[PDB]
Amino acid sequence: EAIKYTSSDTASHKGWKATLSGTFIEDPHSDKKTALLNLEGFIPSDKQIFGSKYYGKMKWPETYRINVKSADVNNNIKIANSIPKNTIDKKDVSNSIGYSIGGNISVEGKTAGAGINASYNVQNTISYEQPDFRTIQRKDDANLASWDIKFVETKDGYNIDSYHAIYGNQLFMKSRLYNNGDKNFTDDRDLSTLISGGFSPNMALALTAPKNAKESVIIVEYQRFDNDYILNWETTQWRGTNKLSSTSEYNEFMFKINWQDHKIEYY
Amino acid sequence: EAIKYTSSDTASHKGWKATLSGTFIEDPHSDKKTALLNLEGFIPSDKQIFGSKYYGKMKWPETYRINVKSADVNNNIKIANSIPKNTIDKKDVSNSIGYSIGGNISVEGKTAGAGINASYNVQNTISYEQPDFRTIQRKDDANLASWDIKFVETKDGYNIDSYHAIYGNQLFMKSRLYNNGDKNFTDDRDLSTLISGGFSPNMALALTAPKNAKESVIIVEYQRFDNDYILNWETTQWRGTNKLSSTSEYNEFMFKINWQDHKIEYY
Amino acid sequence: EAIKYTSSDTASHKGWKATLSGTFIEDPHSDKKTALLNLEGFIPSDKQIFGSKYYGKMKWPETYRINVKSADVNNNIKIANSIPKNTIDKKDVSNSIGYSIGGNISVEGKTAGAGINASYNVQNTISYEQPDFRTIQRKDDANLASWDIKFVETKDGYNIDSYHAIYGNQLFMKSRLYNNGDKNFTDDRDLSTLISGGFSPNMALALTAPKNAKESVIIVEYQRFDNDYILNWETTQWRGTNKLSSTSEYNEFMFKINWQDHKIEYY
Amino acid sequence: EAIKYTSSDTASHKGWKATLSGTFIEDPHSDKKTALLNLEGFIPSDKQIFGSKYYGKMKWPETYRINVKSADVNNNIKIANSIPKNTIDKKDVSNSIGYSIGGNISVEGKTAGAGINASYNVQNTISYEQPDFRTIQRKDDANLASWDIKFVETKDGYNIDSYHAIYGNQLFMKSRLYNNGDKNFTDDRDLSTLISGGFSPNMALALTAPKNAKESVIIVEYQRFDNDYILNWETTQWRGTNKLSSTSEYNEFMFKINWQDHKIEYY
Amino acid sequence: EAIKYTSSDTASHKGWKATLSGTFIEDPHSDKKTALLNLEGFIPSDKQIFGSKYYGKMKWPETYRINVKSADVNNNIKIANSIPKNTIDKKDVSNSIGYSIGGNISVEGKTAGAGINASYNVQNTISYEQPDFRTIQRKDDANLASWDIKFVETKDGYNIDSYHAIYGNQLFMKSRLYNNGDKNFTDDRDLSTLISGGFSPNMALALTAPKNAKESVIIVEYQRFDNDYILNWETTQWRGTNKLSSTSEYNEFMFKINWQDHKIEYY
Amino acid sequence: EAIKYTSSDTASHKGWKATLSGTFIEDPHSDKKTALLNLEGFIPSDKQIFGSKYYGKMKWPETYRINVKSADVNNNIKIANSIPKNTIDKKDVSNSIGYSIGGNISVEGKTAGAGINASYNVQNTISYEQPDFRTIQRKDDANLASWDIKFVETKDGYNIDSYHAIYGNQLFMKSRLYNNGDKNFTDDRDLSTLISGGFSPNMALALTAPKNAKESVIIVEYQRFDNDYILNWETTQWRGTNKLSSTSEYNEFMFKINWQDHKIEYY
Amino acid sequence: EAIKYTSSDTASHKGWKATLSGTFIEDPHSDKKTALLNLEGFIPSDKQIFGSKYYGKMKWPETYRINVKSADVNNNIKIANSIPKNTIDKKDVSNSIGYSIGGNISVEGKTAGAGINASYNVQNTISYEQPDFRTIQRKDDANLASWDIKFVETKDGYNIDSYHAIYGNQLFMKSRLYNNGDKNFTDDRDLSTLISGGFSPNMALALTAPKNAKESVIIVEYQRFDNDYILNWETTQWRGTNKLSSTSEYNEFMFKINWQDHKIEYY
């Protein structure tokens, strides 16, 4: 014998975008009037390239950061549960131990030989699954919920800290020594969809309020940390090296909810 | 206690085709009157072949591009969520380290020998899944949603940038040196269904409008980028090489929705 | 508050068979009166054998072709969505790089030796799934929807274009050199069920019509392309070779739908 | 606003058995009065053994055959869809290409050697799934639906056509040379459940009739084809060889359906 | 507009146990009044051990046998469908063919050698799944339904017919030569749960009766076949050998169903 | 048209705990008034350690035992079905047979050699799944249902009967020769959760009673069998050996059900 | 015919956080008035780093501990079932035994040799799944339910007890010898999400109370055990070693439930 009052609003600002889509609950048997909100937005990657014959520079997003802040004026409302949350990672382990025995019979020009062979074997394999981007929940309190989406490594197997005395960091290197700066960066074909184009997020969260509920304020804060990766032609081959955050683009989105009118709005 | 008003319309123009099938929602408990639209269309590949005894030319689609544009006249309506969206790619990693020891006993003509052997092993395997066509979401704002469907590589393992000093790019090469131009291209048997015949798309999107809702306009824009791949007989063997976009076929489809009459129409 | 009016009809003609089973929708909240049709028919393979002591000839279906054509007299009705549709194919890739080091100690008749060994390893595996028959959607417009079901290759790993200087095409060869013509063809045991007996199809499609809807016409067209594969005894062993379409059996089935009476009929 | 009239009947005759369990549909919105029937019966294998010290003979079923025939007196009723139907078989393919390089350092009695090694690797694996009995749909028309269930091969990997100069066909051979005729046949432990005891079938089928519907007749025809496999002791070892159909047991079951009374009966 | 009349009864007799739990159906639209019965009972294994210093004897169940017999007095009622039923077994097959080429360079005391190597590879693997106990349906008629649950082989890979000149049958042998008779049998730890303790069954079956339905009789017959496996100390090592059925415990359970009163009872 | 009367009670006694949560069924169409009970309790492991510099002793649970006893005073009530029950274990078998042929060409100081090589391969692999604790149903009658949960073996691969002349039983040994008694036992990190902390059970069971149903009594009996495993420092290395049951902790819990009042209670 | 009264409350205290979200049940057919509570909270990891050129110190959580305590004043209420609970761990075992035979033919300078080779193979592999954090249920009584979440080992394969004479414990070591103290710790990229940021828990539990139910008290107690892991530069390479609990942060949260008012509150 409860009623549900849906509502939603969205804002863009510079092509970022946040969709705040909420559902209010006025259950009579529940002492506290609760609501739950889904954040189904989008945020660009802005993968940009600058190059020449002997030099390249690809700007790309190393890590995204989305924080949702609640703010009750009377300070009764509190973000209860916040999805997504962290999970214990699993790894497949397998050990083996074998033994092989045998012998042989040989002959070469009226001289017959023969032999015996014994061997022992051991191997410890360890499989597991690694995502191209690790999504860790950084903070989660009564009025804050932060999430980071940070780059792990490429399908090729290169990370931000990779280093080779000759080629430097081989991250995003199409060719060790062939094509020029702008054409030497990895094509969107093989890249992770997160870097190729805008990606993320999907964050849900329930907030419990009293029957008094008049007004509350949620605030969505996107922050994209852009690393600059450069290619320097060292005469014989390409030598890549990765710098970091020259500028970190940031956009906040203020959402206000009215509980008496059962509506959600921007600003 | 809400009502749902379905509606749909379709247009073809030159054998492309777009199916706009929407469902309106007039929920009283929802302050904003929202609708959601599914785009279940079709678009041809137009795989064409031209050849001779010593020359071939297969035109094929390298990448498709579908952009949906909303346009509110009062500018209240805003495309909230847009499916499909990007996902973090997963890769299976597995490392192993073993050690094998043993020995032997031999003899050859009244002379007995024997030996010992020790060995160590290490291997770092990295499995993952690669689609024949990567589907990346390029843009997604308050009035635009672009998606690209670009070619990754063949089951054989060849990409657009593949090169061999002798055979050139072996993409779509049936035989290195046997049959003639027109007959040397890969048969539809082994090809990806996307190139063999028309394929794509499936894009959903919700747009939130106020109670005032009178008129809005959605616009579906298909664009197919056709690469020309040619085969040149270099006396002893075939030498393939891949050019690009000579002409890029494009088709727009204007859909208009009336919210007061609860109907969707073309133009 | 909508009503659904089911209806169905079937025809055989020469043992082919088409089942047109439709469901009409008279939704008041939908401006256009829509219907959806499932095509759950059957079509024979007609695998026939002719042989002798030193000669064989198995006729078999290389590719099936099913096209559904809509035809509105006023030209308001248009086939909206058509199932099945094409899907981006996925392939499993896995690369590995290892290194193994060790040594040994030996002795043979008062002379002790010893050694060291180092080795490096690399392997690039590529797994994927190939169907015995690729089902590609060829065309899909406002009044046409064509589908092809073409033969890929045998479980043994032979295709239509396979060739060996000695045995020729080993497709459907039970024995290289043992049994005679009629008995040398592959038994239905190991064959694909599509060739062993009749198979296919399953094609659904929705067509949107206005409230005016009086009459429409759907037309199912089956076409089976039969390749003739022959075995010629070349004295020492069998030499198989594959010709093509001597005759291509074809059957059309005219279905007419009345929307005012809510019924479907043949002719 | 439709009504469903269930009904069922079963008959045995010699321990075979057929269960005809139907459901009639009197939908007012459907112009044609349709029914659907499930055939959930059973049929024995009759695996029999006859043997001695130096001779054996196991009779077993090579292939089953079930055909369902409809017969309308006015000839209005027609079996629309018939389950099961054939499916395109899938096979997993995987190709790999590697390269391993290295070297060594050796010494034996004041004489130090050393070396280099290079190697290349290629492998084309092809996995797939093979059932012990292939179920192919042979025929399917307006008044007939035939299905065959034929033996493929054993888990050991032997088929009907297997041959070895010494042991002959090793199908169903427990021991090459040890135990006597009757005791030399494979125990029901390792055998396929289809041969060990009676097995099959499960066949569904819908038939569409007009409102006039008075009477129709379905007919279930089982036929079991029994191959005789014999073991002849050739002094040193067992030599098996497989003959075929000495007698093929057959049983028909006439079912009649009354649509005016909404009942199904035998004969 | 039908009614369902549940009912159930159970009996034990010597710790065996049978649960007959039925559900009657009085559907007006169905001409025949049908019922369906589930048999969810239990039956002990009675794994018993007798031993000494140099002798052992473990009694264990080789195969279970459950037969359900129906008996209509007027002979109208007939067991229609009977679960479980047999299924076609599937096996995974995989074939591979490779080729590896290379060479080497060597030197030992002012004498440089070198070489070439070529190799070819082929392998035919066959995987499949084997249950510890094969459940085959032996008979199924109008008034009988028999099922056998027979022992296949151990996880170690030993069957009833295994034989070794020295150790004899190694079935259920904990140690080849260490501990004494009673302590030499395999502990319940590694054994199959079916032999460790009582196990089975689960058999369902539908019987169709006319409206006249007054009385029917079902009869559940359990039979456990116990093989005696003995261990004889042959001085140096253990020599196991397996006899068979000394006594086969059997228990019948008479259930009678009243359809007029809608109840099921024992005796 | 039936009614369901839920009820529950729980008791602890010494930190063991049993949750008896039942649901009664008063169906008018069912002649017998039936109930079903779920047993979702908990029982401690009591893993205790006692040690010194040269001696250790870890007490741990080898096997748990839970028996549920019903007791009707008039003796009408009988435990019908009892979950969990035993299942036939499955094992994956795979056999392979290959053959590799090749040759070589060599030369060392104006003396050219060459060779041929042939090889054959066979391998019989057998995979399966083994739980750390086998759960076998020991007994199941009209008034008793016993279940055992016994230890199989460690992930490392050691069982209760493992023995090594030097280290003895390596079960639960952290180090062969390094740390002292108390610190030498395996940390809860790698241990099975059943031994690390309390675990089990989950047992359901239905009991059928007549309409007369006044009172019945269920009785839950836990029994934990504790094996004492000791470590004795044999000067150079650790020598572990496993004793058994010094004391077996036991706890009974009497539950009584009133069917007239539709309630369940303790004692 | 029952009623459900939801309710919830949350508290933070120092950025920890506990969400107590309960659902009361007032079923008339149930003698005892029961409730069930879900604990969907969050708790920080507080991974802190302190370092220099030749020294590092990363504080991290080794194990979490969550205990829920119930407290009835009249002492009628008792926590019945408590989720999560422990599960028997499964391990995949596989054994293999092969044999390979062959021979060779060689020749080197007018001297032809030849040989035979025989070999035997055995291998016992054991796969299983190990979580980065083992979640064991420590205690569960009538008024207490404790759960531990303890660290197992890294994806690399290092545990708390790992030791190497040279590098010490390689846990969390980015480089053996390259970068300095603060920069030498493992980046959040590769770390387990539990340590990178706050994680856990999710614990449900049902408590059965009588109709009298006036007040009860639940108490959530978080305790995080922080191990200090340090890196000491031993001139040539890094030597890591792991200390333990310097301080163990702890936070309790008192929740009180009123059953007469059907509400849950903090303190």
Side-chain angles (χ1 to χ4, degrees), chain D residues 126-143:
Chain D
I126 299 95
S127 178
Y128 70 106
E129 193 177 26
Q130 181 146 237
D132 288 25
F133 269 85
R134 297 255 184 193
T135 75
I136 77 179
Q137 185 183 35
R138 219 98 208 199
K139 284 185 279 279
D140 176 31
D141 315 316
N143 300 92

PDB file of all heavy atoms in Angstrom, chain D residues 126-143:
ATOM      1  N   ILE D 126      41.219 -28.288 -34.839  1.00  0.00           N
ATOM      2  CA  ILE D 126      39.794 -28.164 -35.148  1.00  0.00           C
ATOM      3  C   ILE D 126      38.953 -29.017 -34.198  1.00  0.00           C
ATOM      4  O   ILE D 126      38.861 -30.233 -34.362  1.00  0.00           O
ATOM      5  CB  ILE D 126      39.478 -28.598 -36.602  1.00  0.00           C
ATOM      6  CG1 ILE D 126      40.227 -27.727 -37.611  1.00  0.00           C
ATOM      7  CG2 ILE D 126      37.979 -28.515 -36.884  1.00  0.00           C
ATOM      8  CD1 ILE D 126      41.537 -28.317 -38.087  1.00  0.00           C
ATOM      9  N   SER D 127      38.343 -28.372 -33.208  1.00  0.00           N
ATOM     10  CA  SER D 127      37.445 -29.051 -32.277  1.00  0.00           C
ATOM     11  C   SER D 127      35.985 -28.932 -32.709  1.00  0.00           C
ATOM     12  O   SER D 127      35.604 -27.985 -33.398  1.00  0.00           O
ATOM     13  CB  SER D 127      37.608 -28.472 -30.871  1.00  0.00           C
ATOM     14  OG  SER D 127      36.704 -29.079 -29.965  1.00  0.00           O
ATOM     15  N   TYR D 128      35.175 -29.905 -32.298  1.00  0.00           N
ATOM     16  CA  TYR D 128      33.736 -29.887 -32.548  1.00  0.00           C
ATOM     17  C   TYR D 128      33.060 -30.957 -31.692  1.00  0.00           C
ATOM     18  O   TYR D 128      33.738 -31.757 -31.047  1.00  0.00           O
ATOM     19  CB  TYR D 128      33.431 -30.121 -34.030  1.00  0.00           C
ATOM     20  CG  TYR D 128      33.711 -31.526 -34.514  1.00  0.00           C
ATOM     21  CD1 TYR D 128      32.672 -32.407 -34.784  1.00  0.00           C
ATOM     22  CD2 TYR D 128      35.013 -31.968 -34.716  1.00  0.00           C
ATOM     23  CE1 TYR D 128      32.921 -33.691 -35.232  1.00  0.00           C
ATOM     24  CE2 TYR D 128      35.271 -33.251 -35.163  1.00  0.00           C
ATOM     25  CZ  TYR D 128      34.221 -34.107 -35.420  1.00  0.00           C
ATOM     26  OH  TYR D 128      34.472 -35.385 -35.865  1.00  0.00           O
ATOM     27  N   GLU D 129      31.729 -30.964 -31.689  1.00  0.00           N
ATOM     28  CA  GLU D 129      30.962 -31.910 -30.882  1.00  0.00           C
ATOM     29  C   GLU D 129      30.190 -32.882 -31.769  1.00  0.00           C
ATOM     30  O   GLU D 129      29.443 -32.467 -32.657  1.00  0.00           O
ATOM     31  CB  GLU D 129      29.993 -31.161 -29.966  1.00  0.00           C
ATOM     32  CG  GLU D 129      29.381 -32.028 -28.877  1.00  0.00           C
ATOM     33  CD  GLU D 129      28.482 -31.243 -27.941  1.00  0.00           C
ATOM     34  OE1 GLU D 129      27.932 -30.208 -28.372  1.00  0.00           O
ATOM     35  OE2 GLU D 129      28.322 -31.662 -26.775  1.00  0.00           O
ATOM     36  N   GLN D 130      30.377 -34.176 -31.517  1.00  0.00           N
ATOM     37  CA  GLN D 130      29.714 -35.227 -32.283  1.00  0.00           C
ATOM     38  C   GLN D 130      28.813 -36.058 -31.369  1.00  0.00           C
ATOM     39  O   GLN D 130      29.286 -36.616 -30.382  1.00  0.00           O
ATOM     40  CB  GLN D 130      30.755 -36.135 -32.938  1.00  0.00           C
ATOM     41  CG  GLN D 130      30.158 -37.246 -33.786  1.00  0.00           C
ATOM     42  CD  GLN D 130      31.015 -37.586 -34.991  1.00  0.00           C
ATOM     43  OE1 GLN D 130      30.553 -37.530 -36.130  1.00  0.00           O
ATOM     44  NE2 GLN D 130      32.270 -37.945 -34.745  1.00  0.00           N
ATOM     45  N   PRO D 131      27.509 -36.142 -31.686  1.00  0.00           N
ATOM     46  CA  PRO D 131      26.635 -36.975 -30.855  1.00  0.00           C
ATOM     47  C   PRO D 131      26.733 -38.455 -31.217  1.00  0.00           C
ATOM     48  O   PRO D 131      27.001 -38.787 -32.372  1.00  0.00           O
ATOM     49  CB  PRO D 131      25.241 -36.436 -31.174  1.00  0.00           C
ATOM     50  CG  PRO D 131      25.346 -35.942 -32.568  1.00  0.00           C
ATOM     51  CD  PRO D 131      26.754 -35.430 -32.734  1.00  0.00           C
ATOM     52  N   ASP D 132      26.524 -39.325 -30.235  1.00  0.00           N
ATOM     53  CA  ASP D 132      26.529 -40.767 -30.464  1.00  0.00           C
ATOM     54  C   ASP D 132      25.452 -41.174 -31.465  1.00  0.00           C
ATOM     55  O   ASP D 132      25.583 -42.195 -32.140  1.00  0.00           O
ATOM     56  CB  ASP D 132      26.318 -41.518 -29.146  1.00  0.00           C
ATOM     57  CG  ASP D 132      27.534 -41.463 -28.242  1.00  0.00           C
ATOM     58  OD1 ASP D 132      28.333 -40.512 -28.371  1.00  0.00           O
ATOM     59  OD2 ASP D 132      27.690 -42.374 -27.400  1.00  0.00           O
ATOM     60  N   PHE D 133      24.386 -40.382 -31.544  1.00  0.00           N
ATOM     61  CA  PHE D 133      23.321 -40.610 -32.514  1.00  0.00           C
ATOM     62  C   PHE D 133      22.874 -39.294 -33.141  1.00  0.00           C
ATOM     63  O   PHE D 133      22.373 -38.408 -32.448  1.00  0.00           O
ATOM     64  CB  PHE D 133      22.128 -41.289 -31.843  1.00  0.00           C
ATOM     65  CG  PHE D 133      22.173 -42.790 -31.892  1.00  0.00           C
ATOM     66  CD1 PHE D 133      22.867 -43.512 -30.936  1.00  0.00           C
ATOM     67  CD2 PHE D 133      21.513 -43.479 -32.894  1.00  0.00           C
ATOM     68  CE1 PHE D 133      22.903 -44.894 -30.982  1.00  0.00           C
ATOM     69  CE2 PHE D 133      21.546 -44.858 -32.945  1.00  0.00           C
ATOM     70  CZ  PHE D 133      22.241 -45.566 -31.989  1.00  0.00           C
ATOM     71  N   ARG D 134      23.055 -39.169 -34.452  1.00  0.00           N
ATOM     72  CA  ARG D 134      22.618 -37.982 -35.176  1.00  0.00           C
ATOM     73  C   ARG D 134      21.121 -38.050 -35.447  1.00  0.00           C
ATOM     74  O   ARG D 134      20.631 -39.031 -36.007  1.00  0.00           O
ATOM     75  CB  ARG D 134      23.371 -37.850 -36.499  1.00  0.00           C
ATOM     76  CG  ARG D 134      24.868 -37.665 -36.345  1.00  0.00           C
ATOM     77  CD  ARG D 134      25.294 -36.231 -36.622  1.00  0.00           C
ATOM     78  NE  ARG D 134      26.747 -36.079 -36.564  1.00  0.00           N
ATOM     79  CZ  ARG D 134      27.395 -34.916 -36.525  1.00  0.00           C
ATOM     80  NH1 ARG D 134      26.739 -33.760 -36.531  1.00  0.00           N
ATOM     81  NH2 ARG D 134      28.719 -34.907 -36.472  1.00  0.00           N
ATOM     82  N   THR D 135      20.403 -37.006 -35.045  1.00  0.00           N
ATOM     83  CA  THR D 135      18.961 -36.927 -35.259  1.00  0.00           C
ATOM     84  C   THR D 135      18.653 -35.965 -36.400  1.00  0.00           C
ATOM     85  O   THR D 135      18.642 -34.748 -36.207  1.00  0.00           O
ATOM     86  CB  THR D 135      18.212 -36.448 -33.998  1.00  0.00           C
ATOM     87  OG1 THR D 135      18.409 -35.040 -33.816  1.00  0.00           O
ATOM     88  CG2 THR D 135      18.683 -37.206 -32.764  1.00  0.00           C
ATOM     89  N   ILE D 136      18.401 -36.517 -37.584  1.00  0.00           N
ATOM     90  CA  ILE D 136      18.109 -35.712 -38.767  1.00  0.00           C
ATOM     91  C   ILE D 136      16.629 -35.814 -39.128  1.00  0.00           C
ATOM     92  O   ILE D 136      16.032 -36.888 -39.045  1.00  0.00           O
ATOM     93  CB  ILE D 136      18.993 -36.132 -39.977  1.00  0.00           C
ATOM     94  CG1 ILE D 136      18.488 -37.434 -40.620  1.00  0.00           C
ATOM     95  CG2 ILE D 136      20.453 -36.255 -39.536  1.00  0.00           C
ATOM     96  CD1 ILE D 136      19.293 -37.897 -41.815  1.00  0.00           C
ATOM     97  N   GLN D 137      16.038 -34.689 -39.512  1.00  0.00           N
ATOM     98  CA  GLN D 137      14.661 -34.668 -39.986  1.00  0.00           C
ATOM     99  C   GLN D 137      14.661 -34.965 -41.478  1.00  0.00           C
ATOM    100  O   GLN D 137      15.170 -34.175 -42.273  1.00  0.00           O
ATOM    101  CB  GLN D 137      14.023 -33.305 -39.725  1.00  0.00           C
ATOM    102  CG  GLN D 137      12.544 -33.238 -40.075  1.00  0.00           C
ATOM    103  CD  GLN D 137      11.965 -31.851 -39.883  1.00  0.00           C
ATOM    104  OE1 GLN D 137      12.641 -30.849 -40.111  1.00  0.00           O
ATOM    105  NE2 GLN D 137      10.708 -31.785 -39.457  1.00  0.00           N
ATOM    106  N   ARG D 138      14.091 -36.104 -41.856  1.00  0.00           N
ATOM    107  CA  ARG D 138      14.158 -36.558 -43.240  1.00  0.00           C
ATOM    108  C   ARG D 138      13.115 -35.871 -44.118  1.00  0.00           C
ATOM    109  O   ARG D 138      13.449 -35.320 -45.168  1.00  0.00           O
ATOM    110  CB  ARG D 138      13.986 -38.076 -43.320  1.00  0.00           C
ATOM    111  CG  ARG D 138      14.879 -38.731 -44.358  1.00  0.00           C
ATOM    112  CD  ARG D 138      16.136 -39.311 -43.725  1.00  0.00           C
ATOM    113  NE  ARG D 138      17.257 -39.350 -44.663  1.00  0.00           N
ATOM    114  CZ  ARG D 138      18.344 -40.110 -44.531  1.00  0.00           C
ATOM    115  NH1 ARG D 138      18.495 -40.934 -43.499  1.00  0.00           N
ATOM    116  NH2 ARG D 138      19.294 -40.054 -45.451  1.00  0.00           N
ATOM    117  N   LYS D 139      11.857 -35.910 -43.688  1.00  0.00           N
ATOM    118  CA  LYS D 139      10.757 -35.343 -44.465  1.00  0.00           C
ATOM    119  C   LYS D 139       9.807 -34.522 -43.600  1.00  0.00           C
ATOM    120  O   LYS D 139       9.690 -34.749 -42.395  1.00  0.00           O
ATOM    121  CB  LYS D 139       9.974 -36.453 -45.172  1.00  0.00           C
ATOM    122  CG  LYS D 139      10.674 -37.032 -46.392  1.00  0.00           C
ATOM    123  CD  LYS D 139       9.784 -38.034 -47.121  1.00  0.00           C
ATOM    124  CE  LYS D 139       9.798 -39.404 -46.455  1.00  0.00           C
ATOM    125  NZ  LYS D 139      10.988 -40.209 -46.848  1.00  0.00           N
ATOM    126  N   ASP D 140       9.133 -33.568 -44.234  1.00  0.00           N
ATOM    127  CA  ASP D 140       8.158 -32.720 -43.559  1.00  0.00           C
ATOM    128  C   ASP D 140       7.295 -31.996 -44.595  1.00  0.00           C
ATOM    129  O   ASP D 140       7.738 -31.034 -45.222  1.00  0.00           O
ATOM    130  CB  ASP D 140       8.867 -31.716 -42.651  1.00  0.00           C
ATOM    131  CG  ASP D 140       7.909 -30.738 -42.003  1.00  0.00           C
ATOM    132  OD1 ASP D 140       6.751 -31.122 -41.741  1.00  0.00           O
ATOM    133  OD2 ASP D 140       8.317 -29.584 -41.747  1.00  0.00           O
ATOM    134  N   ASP D 141       6.062 -32.471 -44.763  1.00  0.00           N
ATOM    135  CA  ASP D 141       5.152 -31.978 -45.793  1.00  0.00           C
ATOM    136  C   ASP D 141       3.829 -31.552 -45.154  1.00  0.00           C
ATOM    137  O   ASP D 141       3.779 -31.288 -43.953  1.00  0.00           O
ATOM    138  CB  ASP D 141       4.917 -33.072 -46.836  1.00  0.00           C
ATOM    139  CG  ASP D 141       6.199 -33.767 -47.249  1.00  0.00           C
ATOM    140  OD1 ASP D 141       7.210 -33.067 -47.473  1.00  0.00           O
ATOM    141  OD2 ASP D 141       6.197 -35.012 -47.353  1.00  0.00           O
ATOM    142  N   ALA D 142       2.764 -31.477 -45.949  1.00  0.00           N
ATOM    143  CA  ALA D 142       1.448 -31.110 -45.429  1.00  0.00           C
ATOM    144  C   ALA D 142       0.753 -32.253 -44.693  1.00  0.00           C
ATOM    145  O   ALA D 142      -0.233 -32.020 -43.992  1.00  0.00           O
ATOM    146  CB  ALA D 142       0.550 -30.620 -46.554  1.00  0.00           C
ATOM    147  N   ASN D 143       1.237 -33.482 -44.871  1.00  0.00           N
ATOM    148  CA  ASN D 143       0.617 -34.644 -44.238  1.00  0.00           C
ATOM    149  C   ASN D 143       1.614 -35.753 -43.882  1.00  0.00           C
ATOM    150  O   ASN D 143       1.240 -36.922 -43.800  1.00  0.00           O
ATOM    151  CB  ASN D 143      -0.473 -35.213 -45.152  1.00  0.00           C
ATOM    152  CG  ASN D 143      -1.570 -34.207 -45.455  1.00  0.00           C
ATOM    153  OD1 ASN D 143      -1.501 -33.477 -46.445  1.00  0.00           O
ATOM    154  ND2 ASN D 143      -2.588 -34.163 -44.602  1.00  0.00           N
TER     155      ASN D 143
END
